[PDB]
Design a protein around this ligand. Sequence first.
Ligand code: HEM
Ligand code: HEM
Lengths: 418, 55, 55, 54, 98, 47, 51, 32, 440
Amino acid sequence: PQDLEFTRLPNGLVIASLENYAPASRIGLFIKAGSRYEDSNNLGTSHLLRLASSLTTKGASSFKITRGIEAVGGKLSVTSTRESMAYTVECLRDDIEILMEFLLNVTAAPEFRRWEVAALQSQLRIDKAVAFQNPQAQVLENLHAAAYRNALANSLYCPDYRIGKVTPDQLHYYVQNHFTSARMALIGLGVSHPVLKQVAERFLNMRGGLGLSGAKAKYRGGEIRDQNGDSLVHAALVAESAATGSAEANAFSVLQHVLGAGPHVKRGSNATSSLYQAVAKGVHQPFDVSAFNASYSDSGLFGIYTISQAASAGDVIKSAYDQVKTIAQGNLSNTDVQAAKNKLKAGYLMSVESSEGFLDEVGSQALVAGSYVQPSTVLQQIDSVADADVINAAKKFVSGRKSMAASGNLGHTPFVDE
Amino acid sequence: MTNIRKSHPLMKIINNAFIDLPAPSNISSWWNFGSLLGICLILQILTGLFLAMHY
Amino acid sequence: MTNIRKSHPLMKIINNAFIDLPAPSNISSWWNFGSLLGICLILQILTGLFLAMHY
Amino acid sequence: WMLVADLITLTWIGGQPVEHPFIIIGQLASILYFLIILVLMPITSIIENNLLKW
Amino acid sequence: WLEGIRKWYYNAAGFNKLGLMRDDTIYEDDDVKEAIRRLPENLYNDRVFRIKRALDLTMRQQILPKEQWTKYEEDKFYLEPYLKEVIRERKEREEWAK
Amino acid sequence: AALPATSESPVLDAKRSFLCRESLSGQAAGRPLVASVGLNVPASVRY
Amino acid sequence: LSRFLGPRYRELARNWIPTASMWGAVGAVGLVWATDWRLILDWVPYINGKF
Amino acid sequence: SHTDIRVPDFSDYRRAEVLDSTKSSKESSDAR
Amino acid sequence: ATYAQALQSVPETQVSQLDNGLRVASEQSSQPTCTVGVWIDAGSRYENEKNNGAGYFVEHLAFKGTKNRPGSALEKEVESMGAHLNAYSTREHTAYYIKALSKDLPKAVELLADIVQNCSLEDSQIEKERDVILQELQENDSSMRDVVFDYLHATAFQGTPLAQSVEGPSENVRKLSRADLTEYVSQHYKAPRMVLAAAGGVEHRQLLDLAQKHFSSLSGTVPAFTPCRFTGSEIRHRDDALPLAHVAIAVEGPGWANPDNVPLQVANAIIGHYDSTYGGGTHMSSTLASVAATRKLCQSFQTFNICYAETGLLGAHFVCDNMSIDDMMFFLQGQWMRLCTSATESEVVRGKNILRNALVSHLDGTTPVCEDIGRSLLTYGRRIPLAEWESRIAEVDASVVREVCSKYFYDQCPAVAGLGPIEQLPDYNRIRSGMFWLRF
Ligand code: HEM
Ligand code: HEM
């Protein structure tokens, strides 16, 4: 019953709602105000804004916000990528109105009071330390710094030299220049369109224009290597693949799943993954290789990510790379292409089944594409990809400026020129 | 909020004195006499007062 | 290695109760009475004892 | 200062015996001593706060 | 008019004679330290210097010259907007408590 | 979050060791990092 | 002060009335026992023989 | 490993009621 | 759709029963994916001292080759159609579920029939897996959360099979041979102790036909566990080199039965959870969490509700520095007895809403739904509909919470497990004294 009804508001807003009659309803305001829009004098402002939820707003105080959100037992989670933040609220379908009001207060009329921001600035260090306990965070941040020059190079987290110096005026300027009515998508799962339109007319009336336009993220090709000392060397070598939502993007995703992207059977052997088989014939020590695909609006990054022991790291970098070269000259079995397409179609459908995953997918579709395509359309697009495109893919990855980020005991890790 | 035993200065002194004072687990019975002395002292004082009220 | 005044326990208490105690700069003469009462108390005790030895 | 003067008045009254000139003065002094502490001082503080724009 | 009585009481209080302002003499109840903490840097520095000067004057039992007295119309209620917010937050917490 | 996520945030604490090939399976990021920290929910990262 | 009272405080009072009343009974019994309060002790059956 | 450690037997100190592994102790908690 | 109508609109879980005793059950939906898996009643609770760890070993070996499917060929299938094969073995449950597409159910069930019936137990593969399990045990030794929870289980159910860990001691791991593994799988992986759950876009009749076509030749138509005993004790693995100090304090809670679970969860929902990277901080309704955020006593704390078939552990687990264990023990016990003696109505309403959100939001996506189906047909004996959960939560009030907390918390001997710089941790007598209030 019901369908994902889509209506773009005259302001520039796009409201899409799906009444699935679920016991709980979620609402996500997706704002195209990620970390790619931070300039050099305001880095980390987006991070604090991500932690700036629950601060005293214009209509609801911080105490009122927290007590109202959690007395119902609801949600207020900010999910931020390099290009788009997303505020999300979740509660029973009976108490959705209060959650919507709180979300709109925290996303449309924030105060950023001086004492509140000053107290909150300590949480930046804790968030960075907790996130960076996973080495993949450091590796990916270094990769983005060493791959893109200006726009996407900004980290998802506030650099240590800006912790404590994020003035409230910076937050106000960021909101006024990026939280615009033409850069957002109020997506509702478990609600009805008229209700979502009333809240759209409730406040939702910022400058309405397209805000401060970003800059085209130029490619760098640099190499950032840090020696943190932990035994497990994480390395990642990428090249500029293509912008998201393109034929080359689909070809690169198919190539990612051909190479292998994560495990399927828990504690298996990744037999289908060509990279894992190619590397395993070399190093006989605990390792893990996987194709790393990133697809942003303006450009993308396709490469290989290898966790390996310090001594063997170079071999893991070499043989795996050679494996990709094997595809570049053309060694792709059509059976492998079909298997990768099946894996892609599955992974997509099993990512959409979850309510949260559905919400994020629709939010990304609304922000980037501007419309919504049913899963059948995406599956047909994936099926339309031919083997020759996957062969482009390999040639483009092989012949290009390679940005590499490494972390660990880098005593033997090869450099970009090696 | 703070625990009154560990925040009230009088109760803080009492707590550090004989509530949460780290004491060895293997002190023999011979240490009890210390307290006994104090106890005796207290008893003495009481009795002394009731003797000074008719002497 | 450290001043006895703020390292010896009894000396530490005396120091941070009568020597290095931060007091307001403009307390008037009335505040002085707080001391006088205490002195009076001692003068009441020390003299009083000497009456108890012939009373 | 009226309270202090009332205290000296009470001291003097207690010094004197209990006759017609002193009984009424003692009653008034006791009533005033309680009234200043419990009634006059708080209400006066309210008046001052109002008079000083807070 | 009532403003005449307010002026008379302001002159009779005498805290202007010390160079102080109204919000410089408020008793620091539990709300007051929180209100002070939220003050901007410049206001806090001016407040602390003014109070230090007042204590200096009272230690010598002296007052500012007649020229440097905070006139009743120049007195500013710098703390009042912050104190109102602190009191309102406390009231809201109390109302949610009951 | 009625649910307290899964893994909480022990700052100033060591991560889960490794040292087995199976336990190191698919730890290689394949999608861009995204961070999720919000009111009444532990912070998380996903790649 | 008027800051108290309201919804939450009345059921707190109701919950703690049984315990407070039992403590009051404890105090009453301890008082009558401690001072050997005659007035009550010529009524309880077995202790009447004390006097 | 943490799994290698096991609580040593206290059977000579335990009360008679709580002494059998195949019987809950909540019933005898009130008595003890 | 006023919530209650939405709860009624949730499709039901049809339940069948094969002649072999297989409790085939399915919940039909419209999603194009599915999660089908068998839940077996094996686990460490049914493992003796010598057999301890055999369940984990057989779970390891399950996916690494079968009889009909030799080795990675089985895996070759799972990745070929995009399926995600996963497993987990609790102290009383085991499960192997295969995420797949709705059109791959005929094959996926087949794979499951191969995993649980025609296993391999290859001796060389056993040798390769033994060192892998040893290294996994070493990895878990650094898991200061799992280690603490295993310490709590050992010190609470001492002298009973429930004290045993899932992986088992390393001695048993190295000693275990193929004969023990095949004996274990033949004794515990019996048809009456298995439930073939399948959530998502699977029609129940198709599931029944598949199960009858594949799982037919299982066991015909016995470890039934022994009632374990709770023993209030404490384990102190004092290790000051560890940065933080994990502490877990529990009391004998209820089981899967004993509806007192529903009010009790509400009480836990009142205490809630918190860590450093949270939101409101010193505003959340939980007095424990508000105080923790105000004074920065800890980096984390949680309230668990580990409940087994006949008993269970109810309590909290907090991670804090060495200088704040006493303060949080004080505050946690204070909150417990505040709920015990005067729980108020508003906090009960908040707990009811939080529990409602937990049950509702937890059951989204095919994997949690299938897991709930498989776990409920084993523990409760019936997939409890969300409407029944709503009614049971509704019946809970302030008096019920006070009574149930008095039954399970007041004047009870707890089980404590501390690991790290736990010197501050109050002695067991002080904790037990905190388990009762003199004022009340
Ligand atoms: C340090 C503790 C004390 C000790 C060791 C102590 C010792 C003694 C001794 C040995 C006697 C003689 C008893 C006799 O011969 O019958 C005595 C008598 C007396 N003490 Fe103390 N005393 C102490 C504390 C006090 C105090 C504090 C007072 C006053 C309040 C006091 C007042 C008296 C009086 C009045 C007598 C005479 C009554 C009598 O001798 O029986 N005593 N004391
Ligand atoms: C709190 C402080 C004290 C006060 C206010 C106080 C008060 C008094 C007063 C008013 C008198 C009557 C004096 C007279 O009428 O001649 C007196 C006498 C006496 N006091 Fe104190 N006193 C105090 C401390 C002490 C102390 C500490 C002792 C014991 C050492 C003591 C022992 C005596 C004695 C023995 C007498 C009788 C001597 C006489 O006839 O004056 N007093 N006291």
